[PDB]
A paper describes a structure:
We hoped that the crystal structure of CgnD might yield additional insights and determined the structure to 2.35 Å resolution. Intriguingly, it appeared as if the dimer provides two antiparallel channels for substrate binding that terminated at the respective active sites. The catalytic triad comprised Asp325, His328 and Ser79, and the distance observed between the Asp325 atom Oδ2 and His328 atom Hδ2 was within the expected range (1.8 Å). The distance between His328 atom Nε2 and Ser79 atom Hγ could not be determined because a sulfate ion was bound at the active site, which led to a rotation of the Ser side chain. Removal of the sulfate in silico and subsequent rotation of the Ser side chain did not allow the distance to decrease below 2.8 Å. The resulting lack of nucleophilicity appeared a probable cause for the slow turnover and was supported by our inability to label CgnD with phenylmethylsulfonyl fluoride. When CgnD was added to the product of CgnA–CgnB–CgnC–CgnE reactions containing 3a and 3b, we observed the slow production of 4a ([M]+ calculated, 495.2238; observed, 495.2239; mass error (Δ) = 0.2 ppm), which represents the crocagin core scaffold (des-methyl and des-carbamoyl) and also corresponds to the mass produced by the cgnE knockout. Slow proteolytic processing of modified precursor peptides has been observed in a number of RiPP biosynthetic pathways and may be linked to biosynthetic timing. The intermediates 3a and 3b are then cleaved by CgnD to release the core scaffold and make the N terminus available for methylation by CgnL.
Numbering used by the authors:
A (entry chain A): 7 to 167, 201 to 265, 275 to 347
B (entry chain B): 1 to 161, 201 to 265, 275 to 347
Write the structure that this text describes.
Amino acid sequence: ETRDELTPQMKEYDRAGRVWVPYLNYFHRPNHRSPVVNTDSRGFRFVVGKDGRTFSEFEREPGERVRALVGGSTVFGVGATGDAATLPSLLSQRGPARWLNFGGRAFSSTQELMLFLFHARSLGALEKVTLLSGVNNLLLFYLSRDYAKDYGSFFATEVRREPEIVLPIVDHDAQKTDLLHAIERDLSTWKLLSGALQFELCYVLQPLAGWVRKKPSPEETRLFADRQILREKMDLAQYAWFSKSLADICRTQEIPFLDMNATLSALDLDGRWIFVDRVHLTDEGNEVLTQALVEGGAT
Amino acid sequence: MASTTLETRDELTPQMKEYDRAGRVWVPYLNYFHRPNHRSPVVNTDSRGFRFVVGKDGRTFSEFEREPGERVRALVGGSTVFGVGATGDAATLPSLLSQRGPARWLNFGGRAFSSTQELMLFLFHARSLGALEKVTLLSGVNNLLLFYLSRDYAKDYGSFFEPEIVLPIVDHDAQKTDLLHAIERDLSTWKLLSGALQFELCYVLQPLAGWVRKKPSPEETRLFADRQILREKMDLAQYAWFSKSLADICRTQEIPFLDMNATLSALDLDGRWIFVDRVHLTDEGNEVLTQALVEGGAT
């Protein structure tokens, strides 16, 4: 099969496993061990710095400079061939400061914020939190049958089981705007935490294959050939609206904003193998993304 | 068959019928909140499930509505803040505090909430509230009660009403210090919010009938006659440990703390009808509590 042929590492992200967690609803199974992916006792992915030095369990020594990359599966590094090939590892291997992997597979913006609030007190002082996010809230909105504007939603809302707070959606395209509220509210909270914990904050719209203008590599073409939202609902008009909408939110709140889809389109990636699927990145993808992050002042 | 009479609950506390019917809905992340737009003589909730507050001159406040110049404070907690046991919205603590002035008080009581749910409810709605002068937390007991009802627990997250994050409890009494972590962690987030939103913060251990020294009223004697968790797990030894443990957390974080159980034991309430049940207050109880809160400097 193509996925096993070209991206064999994916069989291991299938086995990594999720567990139910109160409030968060889910996180990664802790203590997972494999050559591709390793998680510590709280479910956080290992980070690899220089010469194979591994960091986990919120370990922090004196004088260490620490930063946090927060997001979904792009931050976790689904599609990487190893812990060392993920963004936090690549960022740690370059810059002065080490980076924490606060990526949560399939997390919405609200789960990203909550994961940080649940553990912030164990991390020490952070210089910079970079948020690499956005796409999941758009995706899971269109995968939802019901939605609460004030709270948002998350993927496995099979968890839920006359007046209600979570209301049925009648027209996803006509009610789009409602999903922005959760992002704007979550960003406002990050802004509050930025000043209180004295870290710089940057919001980065994560890359989506259909939104990056790039002649695909032979590998990509074959991988994508194997659902109507990620298709029809996520067209370039959608990108136009979403990107603009998040840039407006961030500007109003004086949050540096960086749209990685536009950044990757401006680079010359024609024919380069960047994606293992429409959402996830290869090792080379992470290398390029990291380069663009550093370059864009988001690190 | 001999004629049937009203249950002691319906005869002495008929308003409890309305609290049974008021309703509870599922909400993501919070897991549950009050059914919105509920109408009854006893209890009313707005479009978000928050209870109505009655200010001076019988004026009702809801929907986070605010006028220019208003001084606003927030009472955050569980069913004691919500006002289960009251005969009307106007007999609840936020209403009693708003009538006294100088500020109007929001009812951020969530029925059955844990400390974590209380914090999340606030983080989900804070941006809509405007400036707050003081948040008063009236809480604690539920985290203890829910810990002893839980069969499983994740120390980093808590709980509410192949490896795992949520671990089974082997001995509640021996693992009971685990529940302090969630309280201390949430309080540190409150402490952080108090600085960023510039409001005063104060913690009040909510009353529990078994923890208040008071010769029972005749109503209370009938009502209490009818879960050992209340019988043996919440004994005076438990009260001693819990109260002292919360005092230590609050002193470390420089948060003013008030043990309402001790405050009420010191007053002359012998024979007075304070408790609708072991956890819920009468109207009279809310007046006593309000006076104690104001005199204690917790408002």
